[PDB]
Design a protein around this ligand. Structure first.
Ligand code: NI
Length: 341
């Protein structure tokens, strides 16, 4: 059965609610983004209307086989009527195709559902500027002050400089980057660009990237591993064993691997600056964990919420323990007392 924080009151609508069977009274199922915890339950046998971005629609059709007649893509930054209710989709600054959803309810209430997002000051100049929000359904993944990490631009700067130095010292080094879902593609695209290479990958991953409307993609990626000196591998293989095994398959073209594991936050963020990050090394294999986040830091979340001044906040992450819920409610009250709303 569908929990309350996935229902939109006064509508026939649900958000990211595909794992509960037929939800009673649901006339339209919204999907914020193509991450498996959120799409859990969708397949080619789904027969209700799905509302989403163009990019999420390409992934539902090609990767999960959902039939076309049930896919309803909406443009961004555009007022749309769905089953008699005005809605707007906004870029969430998460993975490709990820949206926030503004709902203008028949009684005058306005609801923002962030999906998953990385709050940014540029959101203060979207269609959010114009009007009041009564309820905020908020991605609270990192809602605690210990959760700090750098900007995505600093992280990318570190990765490009590290890869360019290693391969210039040793032209026979291979670079490998881990992946397990969509998102974070800037990591491997920026590294391949500085190295003058396409990115090599499996047919399955190529198919997924082909759904993403990335400009000039055909010039950036390939399934011909032999032509490429940046390879993608599943995240599970980014360890000394998996990487040894990969280097054997490359036919003595390379004598060294430099690898990247994009994570979210890890406790080594509480001590070490991005500049000071060092790898794990065994022999001719080095593995860097880099903190590339597609979710708000605590500070970015607090700034967003203090700017929007919602009347009520409903968290959508970390909702399963009393201690988590109590912690998040304390911070919401500090934020409100500090800013005066
Ligand atoms: Ni996500």
């Amino acid at each position: 059965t569908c929990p309350f924080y996935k229902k939109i009151p006064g509508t026939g609508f649900t958000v990211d609610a595909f794992q509960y069977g037929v939800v009673e009274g649901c006339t339209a199922y919204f999907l914020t983004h193509f991450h498996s915890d959120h799409y859990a339950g969708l397949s080619k046998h789904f027969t209700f209307p799905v509302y989403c971005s163009e990019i999420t629609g390409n992934l539902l059709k090609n990767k999960l086989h959902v039939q076309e007649q049930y896919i309803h893509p909406l443009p961004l930054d555009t007022e749309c009527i769905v089953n008699g209710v005005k809605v707007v989709l906004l870029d969430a600054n998460h993975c490709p195709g990820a949206v926030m959803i503004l709902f203008y309810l028949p009684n005058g209430t306005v609801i923002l559902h962030t999906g998953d997002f990385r709050a940014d000051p540029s959101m203060e100049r979207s269609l959010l500027a114009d009007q009041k929000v009564h309820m905020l359904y908020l991605d609270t993944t990192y809602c605690s002050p210990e959760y700090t990490f750098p900007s995505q631009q600093e992280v990318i700067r570190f990765a490009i400089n590290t890869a360019f130095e290693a391969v210039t010292l040793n032209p026979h080094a291979l670079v490998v980057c881990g992946t397990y879902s969509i998102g974070k593609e800037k990591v491997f695209l920026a590294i391949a660009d500085v190295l003058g290479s396409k990115v090599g990958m499996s047919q399955e991953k190529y198919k997924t990237l082909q759904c993403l409307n990335i400009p000039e993609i055909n010039s950036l990626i390939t399934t011909d591993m032999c032509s490429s000196l940046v390879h993608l591998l599943p995240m599970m293989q980014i360890n000394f064993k998996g990487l040894q095994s990969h280097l054997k398959k490359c036919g003595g073209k390379y004598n060294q691997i430099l690898a990247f594991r994009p994570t979210g936050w890890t406790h080594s963020n509480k001590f070490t600056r991005i500049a000071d990050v060092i790898p794990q090394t065994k022999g001719n294999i080095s593995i860097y964990g880099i903190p590339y986040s597609e979710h708000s830091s605590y500070l970015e979340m607090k700034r967003f919420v203090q700017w929007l001044k919602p009347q009520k906040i409903i968290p959508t992450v970390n909702v399963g323990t009393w201690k988590s819920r109590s912690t998040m409610e304390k911070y919401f009250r500090e934020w409100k007392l500090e800013a005066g709303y």
